[PDB]
Symmetry: none
Subunit: 320 residues, 4 copies
C-alpha cells in the first residue's frame, strides 16, 4: 500500500506543481544523505531521527521557514503513502517551535523584495523611451506590465498573443488562466493603462510576435538585437529576473559582495511596489484585493507591511 500508492501519486505528476515535485525530491535527497551519514534508516522516518535532523539544519544556519519546509516535504511524502505524519508526534512538533523561537530571539526576520514604486517606473521610463533597441523596448514594456497587472513573472511568461484584447477605450486586456492560487478556465482579466499599452504596442509591432496568435508575448532577444518569437518555447523566468536586475544595475550601479538577497530589484518587486503605492494612495481594501488577485486581507497586509514610516499617516497627523 505504501509502495504502490506513491506510484499512484507519481502517475498523475501534473496533478501537483512541478516545483513541488522538485522540492520533494530535493528534500528527500538531503534527508537520505544525512541518514546515510549517521547510520540511520530513512523510511519510514522515525520522530527522533527527524528531530536530530531538523536540529542539524538549525545548527547549520538555515532559516526557520526552510526547515519547516523540509518537515512539510516529509509530511507530504509520508501522508501521500497513507503513513502517519512526522509532525503528529510531540518530539518534532515541539522542536520545530523551539527552533522558531530560538532563531527569532537571535534577531531573525523574513526578508521582502525591494520596492519598485511609481517614481522608479517613471525614472526608468525616462531612459529607455527614446532608445529604440529591441532589448530596451521589451524590458520597459515588461516592467510596465509587471507594475500594472501585479502578475507574477511566471504568469507573464505564459501570456500568449491570443489572450490580448481591447476595451472600447483602447486599453488592452490580458486574460490569465492559471496563477499560483487560481486554476480555472474562466480565468481573470487584468486591464492595462494607456502608457503601458503604447509600451507594449511598440514591442509587438517591432518584435514580430503578431504573426502567430499562439506566439508567446515576451520572448528572448539575441545579441545584436534580433528577436526570436516562439509559440512553443516559453521565456524562462530567470531572464525575467535578470531584466529587473539589469534595470536596477543600470540606474544605481553594480551590487556589492555581501551576497545578500533582495539587494537589487527582483520578480516580486512590482507586486509589493504597486501594493505599497495603492496603500499610500487611499485605495480601499476590495480594490487592492482585486488588483492583485487576492482572496484574503492578511496577504495584502503582509505585502504593504514595510511602508516608509517617516512619511506615514501618524507622522503626518501629528503635524497640527
Amino acid at each position: 500500500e505504501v509502495r504502490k500508492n506513491l506510484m499512484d501519486v507519481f502517475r498523475d505528476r501534473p496533478a501537483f506543481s512541478e516545483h513541488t515535485w522538485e522540492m520533494l525530491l530535493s528534500v528527500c535527497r538531503s534527508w537520505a544523505a544525512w541518514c546515510k551519514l549517521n547510520n540511520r534508516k530513512w523510511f519510514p522516518a522515525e520522530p527522533e531521527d527527524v528531530r536530530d535532523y531538523l536540529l542539524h539544519l538549525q545548527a547549520r544556519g538555515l532559516a526557520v521557514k526552510t526547515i519547516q519546509q523540509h518537515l512539510c516535504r516529509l509530511n507530504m511524502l509520508h501522508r501521500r503513502s497513507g503513513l502517519p505524519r512526522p509532525s503528529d508526534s510531540n518530539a518534532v512538533s515541539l522542536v520545530m517551535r523551539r527552533i522558531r523561537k530560538e532563531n527569532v530571539d537571535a534577531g531573525e526576520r523574513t526578508k521582502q523584495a525591494l520596492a519598485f514604486e511609481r517614481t522608479d517606473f517613471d525614472q526608468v521610463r525616462s531612459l529607455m523611451e527614446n532608445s529604440d533597441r529591441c532589448q530596451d523596448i521589451r524590458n520597459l514594456a515588461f516592467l510596465g506590465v509587471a507594475y500594472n497587472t501585479l502578475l507574477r513573472i511566471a504568469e507573464i511568461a505564459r501570456i500568449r498573443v491570443k489572450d490580448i484584447s481591447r476595451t472600447d477605450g483602447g486599453r488592452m486586456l490580458i486574460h490569465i488562466g492559471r496563477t499560483k492560487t487560481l486554476v480555472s478556465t474562466a480565468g481573470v482579466e487584468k486591464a492595462l493603462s494607456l502608457g503601458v499599452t503604447k509600451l507594449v504596442e511598440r514591442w509587438i509591432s517591432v518584435s514580430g510576435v503578431a504573426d502567430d496568435p499562439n506566439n508567446y508575448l515576451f520572448c528572448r532577444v539575441r545579441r545584436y538585437g534580433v528577436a526570436a518569437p516562439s509559440a512553443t518555447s516559453q521565456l524562462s523566468t530567470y531572464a525575467l529576473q535578470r531584466i529587473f536586475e539589469a534595470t536596477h544595475r543600470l540606474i544605481y550601479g553594480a551590487k556589492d559582495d555581501s551576497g545578500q538577497r533582495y539587494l537589487a530589484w527582483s520578480g516580486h518587486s512590482a507586486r509589493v511596489g504597486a501594493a505599497r503605492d495603492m496603500a499610500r494612495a487611499g485605495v480601499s481594501i476590495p480594490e487592492i484585493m482585486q488588483a492583485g488577485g487576492w482572496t484574503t486581507v492578511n496577504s495584502v497586509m503582509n505585502f504593504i507591511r514595510n511602508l516608509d514610516s517617516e512619511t506615514g499617516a501618524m507622522v503626518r497627523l501629528l503635524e497640527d
Copy 2:
C-alpha cells in the same frame, strides 16, 4: 434504461425499485443526460473489458483520461463523473470520486486542459445598439414572422427571461398596468423562490410590439393559448395551447437575426459565434452597467445570486478596469 443491464448485487435491486417508483423526483434533462452518459460508460467498458457496475477507481480513471483523449472539455468530464456518482449513490454504493485515484487524475485533467488554453466561452452580447439596428430593419415588415421575432427580441431583452420561460408564457399571463405597460405574470416557474421575480414588466415601445403580434397572429382568441407559437410558411400562424415553440427554435431566431446583419457564420465549429439565448441577458447587463445601474438592481433584473457572475459580463468595460489603471494615469 433497459439497454444495458448487469446484476450481481441483489440488495441493490431493492434500492433501484424506489428510484423507478419516484421517476418524477428528477428532471427530464437529468434522466436523459444520465442515460447519455451511461451508454458511453457501458460502451467504453465493453470495448475495454471492464465491469461497469459497480465501478471502481482505476477503471474509471482510464475512462476520464479517455474522455480527455477525445478532446472533451473539463466541465463535461466532471458532468460524466457526476452522473456516475448519481448512479452509484442512488444504488447505495460509494462514489468512485471519493477515491484518491480518481480525484488526482481529475485535478490532473483540470490542470492540463487549463494550461492547454481551454477558456470558458461567454455568450455574445445582444445590446441596445444591436436591438435598435434590428428595430430599424424588421420594423415595418408585413410578414407575420418578422413581427413575431421582433416582439420576441423585445421580450428577451426587456425581461432578461430565459428561453424556456418565454416559451411557457400563455396569453392569460399578460396584464395591462395603469401606465398602459404590459405586465407579464410568470406562470408555472419550476422554482419555489424565483429570485428574478414572478412579474416582469415591459416598456411601451415593446408593449406595442407584443400587441401588434397578438393582433396579427390571433393568439388572444383563446386565453390559455401560448403567446409565442409557430408561424408556418407563407405566414400562417398556428396557435396551440397544447404545444410549445421549442427553445431551439428561439435560438434559431437569434441566429437568424445575427446572420441577417453580419452575414453567415464561420466555418470554425465553435460556440457563441452568433447570438443565442443568453445574449439578451448579457447585453442587458452590460447596458445597465454602462448606465451606472447598481449591481443589486442588475442582479435583481436578471435573477443572479452571485456578484462575480455579473462581474464577468462587464469585465471588459472601462467602468471596471484595474485600480492600478486609475492610479497610473494621474
Copy 3:
C-alpha cells in the same frame, strides 16, 4: 411517549435534553410538535415511531402532502425527524433513497401545480412617512411607543424578537446625537461583541420622546419597550420583556388604521407583520443605488444570496430595464 430501545440511545437523548438551552427554544417547540404529529400518525396507522423506518416516513410525508400542507413544511418535519435520530446516534431517515426521492417528488409535484413561498407585505419609506404624519403629534402613550418602535425596526432592520430584548443600558450615543444600540444575540450571530445599530436624527427624537413619556430610564436594566395598559399606564419591566405577538399586532393595527380591515380569504401577509420592516428597507436600499457591501452591513448578512432573496419581489414597472428602454 418512549418505549424500550437501546441504552446508548436513551443516554444520548437524555444528554441532549439535559443541555436544552444550547439550542433555540423555537427549535424545541417545533421538535416536540413534529414528534407529536408523527407519533399520532404512527399510532393511527399502527406503526412504530422510533426508530423510524424509511417507508413509514415516506407514507407520512405523502400523507402530509395530500393533507394540503406546504412543501417546506413537510421538508421541516423531515429535517426534525433527522434532528431526532442524528442526536440519538442513529442513521438519518433522510439518507435513505425512498424518503429523499419522495421528498423531491413531493416538492416538484406541488411546484408544478403552482406554489410559491409568500413574502411579508413591504413596509417602505413612504409608509413610514405616512404613519409619521399620522401619529407623530399625539400625546397618547401608545402612539408614541408604536411610532418609536416602527422607526427603530425600519432604521435598524432588526428582527422583532431582537428589538423586544433591547435594554436601556444598551443604548449609547454619538456626538451628532445619533443613538447607538447594542444587539448581543441575533439569528446568525451569538457573541458578546455583538453589533451596533445606529439610528438617525428623527428616529432618535422619537425614541427620546418614548423614553421621556414612558419613564423606562428609571433603571438601565429596563427593556426599552414595554406593555401599555389601559388609560395609558406604562408598566416598565426588567424581568419580563414584551412579547412578539404584541409587536405583530402593532404592525397589523397600524396597517388597518390606514387601509381598513382584512378580508376573509385567509391568506397570509394580507397586512403588515414583523418581517415587513426588514424587507421594505432592503427594497428601499436597492432602489436607492446602495452598493452590496453597504447593504450587508445594514442587515448583518454574510451572504449576498439572502439579500437577493429579500429584494426578489421588487417592482419591475419602475425597474431598471423599463427605465432604460424608455430613454
Copy 4:
C-alpha cells in the same frame, strides 16, 4: 514538577523536555488552569486526569456559576485540550456533552447581558490636554511619562514592545525626526513594520528624556527606565521596566486629568496599554485615513477589528442613516 498524578508519561517527558517551545505566559495559564481543575476535582472526588467529558462538563458549569466570562471558560477548556492533545488522549472538546454545555454557557451568558469591553481611547485631544498640563515641569517623572505617552500615541506599539526599546535602536533621519528600530519582535513577520518613526514634537520630547535621564551613556540601555524618589533615574541595560508600571503611567495620568477610578470592579474605566492604539485609529479614521493605512499603522490584519474602534463615529453609521436623513 507541578500537581502530580503509563505510555502518556513518556509523552509528557517529551513535552516538558522542549519547554522553550511555548511562551512563559502560556505555561503560566496552563499551570493555573491545571491548578483550578485539580482543586475542583479533589473537592468533588473526580479523576483529574485523564479528564472525563462529564467531569469537565460539571467543572465548566461550575466555572459559569462563579460568574466568569465565556472567554475565560473557553481558555480553561483550551488548556485542558492542550494537555490532552499533548498526551495523545481524546480532547474533551470533541465529546458531545462538553460541546453542548459550551454552546449552552455561550447562549446563557450572552443572554445574561455580557459584553466585551473596549479600551478607553487615548486621543489627540487628551494628549494635548496632558501636554498642556505637564510639558514645562522640570521633574524627571513628568518628562518620562510625557515622552512615553508620546511614543505610545505615535508608534501604536504595544507596551511590551515599548519596554524592550534600547538606546542603540534609536536612529535619526535627515528631516530631524526619530527612527525607532524594533530590536526583537516576538515573531518572524511584523505586519506593523520593524521601523517606526516619530514626529518633531515627539522627537524633542523623547530626546529631552534621553538628555535629562543620562540613558545615552550606554547604547545598550533601555530607553525608558525606573524613576526613584526625588527624581533619581535608574538607567539599566538588563532590568527592563515592567508592563504594569507602564500602564500605571496611563491610569495615573487619567487620575491626574479626571477623577479617581470609581469602585465598580470594572475594566477600562481608566486609560490602559490599549488606549493609545484605539485613540490613534479613531483619530486616523476621523482624519480620513483609509483602512489599509490604519491596519498597517497598528499591525492589525482584519478589517472588522479596526472597524470596531470607530463603530461609534458619524462617518461610519451605515446606509439607512443617509437614506433617512433626507
